Paper text:
Two CspA orthologous proteins, [name] and BGA66, that are capable of binding complement system components C7, C8, and C9 and thus inhibiting the assembly of the MAC have been identified in [name], allowing [name] to escape the attack by the immune system. The importance of [name] and BGA66 in the resistance to the immune system was supported by the gain of resistance to complement-mediated killing after expression of either protein in the serum-sensitive B. garinii strain G132. In conclusion, we have solved the crystal structure of the key complement inhibitory protein [name] from [name]. The overall fold of the [name] protein looks similar (Cα root-mean-square deviation from 1.66 Ǻ to 2.63 Ǻ) to the previously released crystal structures of the orthologous PFam54 proteins CspA, BBA64, BBA66, and BBA73 of B. burgdorferi.
All three [name] constructs were overexpressed in E. coli, but only BGA7162-251 yielded crystals, suggesting that the flexible region present in the other two constructs interfered with the crystal formation, as previously observed for the BBA66 protein of B. burgdorferi. The crystals used for collection of native diffraction data also belonged to the space group P31, but the unit cell size was smaller and only six molecules were found per asymmetric unit with a water content of approximately 45%. The final model of BGA7162-251 was generated for residues 69–251 since the first four residues that remained after cleavage of the His-tag and residues 66–68 were not built due to weak electron density. By surveying the crystal structure of [name], we identified cysteine 173 in α-helix D as the residue that forms disulfide bridges, which is responsible for cross-linking of the two monomers. Furthermore, comparative sequence analysis of the PFam54 orthologous proteins reveals that cysteine 173 is not present in any other orthologous PFam54 protein, suggesting that dimerization by cysteine cross-linking is a unique feature of [name]. The structure of CspA showed the highest similarity to [name] among the other PFam54 orthologs of B. burgdorferi, with a Cα root-mean-square deviation of 1.66 Ǻ. While [name] did not bind CFH and CFHL-1, an interaction with components C7 and C9 has been demonstrated. However, the lack of binding complement regulators can be explained by the inability of [name] to form a homodimer in the same manner as CspA. However, the proposed N-terminal residues 37–63 involved in the binding of C7 and C9 are not visible in the crystal structure of [name] since they form a flexible loop region connecting the protein structural domain to the cell surface.
Author numbering:
A (entry chain A): 12 to 194
B (entry chain B): 11 to 126, 134 to 194
């Protein structure tokens, strides 16, 4: 059944991410160390994983790219004026992209288990559509995130040289979760 | 660290350890739900199957012997048309729900951590773990009863059926007060 296959493929997809992420991280790259050291907000180990699922998958598990993004975020964080923009990128955009995907699987699982075939069939189309939309969103974010890594390395619009420039760029390309949704 | 954050962490770690242990046990060819897998009427997906095993295997402490005796119990009941449904209800209605409640709370705790409750989610979380602990207690009492043939439950499938019916009536019976 469609919902049963959907859960299965997501389940395996999840597992593969968990292994890959932990690989990369086993090598001492502390991607979110700076956010971990922050006393104002507490990045739990779950929050952290979710964030990485989206980011790492988005950057194809290329340590180099992840490190660049790390520098971007740590530059912004180390400038009090723009700290918030790093946090918003992390907690408001990246994390939401992930949660949506997770929310739907949490709810597709509910239809598989708790609900009988009739209900199951009612809910079916909408959950599938949402699932799709939430994966596509993450793809569009990823596309955008690679364009940003490249832009950074080329110092396009002085984004490597100028934190203020950098801040504006991150603001204008990551305005809202909804902007990454399919049209 | 917020209470919810620590609640999710401890659940997450607990989940992971269960996955590994379950897979270990299963790697040795014990096909705990084979008979249900072979069933065309209903479908056990490999997720559903894992969830069922989480509650059962953790309840029986990952003791292969105990899991094998439970397997007999369930396959006996399944192979008798009259009582098949009792084996299915035990699996899909009781065990799976006990698991689902737990799983549900975490999916919701996580949700509150990120996108946004506290005291109610913590209550529910406690309740749903307790429920599983009461079920586990009951399940061990059943396996011991079965091995002793108490009330002829190993000797008599009908007797067996009535015992399963009277000790696993509903999910709600395992909840705390």
């Amino acid at each position: 059944s469609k919902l049963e296959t959907a859960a299965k493929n997501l389940e395996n997809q999840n597992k593969q991410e968990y292994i890959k992420i932990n690989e990369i991280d086993a090598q001492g790259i502390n991607f979110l160390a700076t956010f971990k050291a922050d006393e104002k907000d507490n990045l739990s180990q779950y929050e952290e994983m979710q964030i990485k699922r989206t980011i790492y998958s988005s950057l194809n598990y290329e340590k180099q790219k992840i490190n660049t993004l790390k520098e971007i975020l740590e530059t912004l964080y180390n400038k009090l004026q723009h700290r918030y923009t790093s946090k918003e990128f992390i907690y408001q955009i990246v994390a939401s992209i992930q949660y949506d995907i997770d929310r739907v699987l949490c709810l597709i699982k509910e239809a598989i288990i708790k609900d009988n075939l009739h209900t199951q069939n009612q809910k079916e189309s909408e959950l599938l559509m949402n699932l799709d939309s939430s994966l596509k969103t993450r793809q569009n974010f990823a596309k955008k995130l690679n364009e940003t890594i490249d832009d950074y390395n080329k110092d396009s619009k002085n984004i490597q040289t100028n934190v203020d420039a950098l801040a504006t760029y991150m603001k204008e390309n990551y305005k809202t979760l909804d902007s990454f949704k399919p049209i």
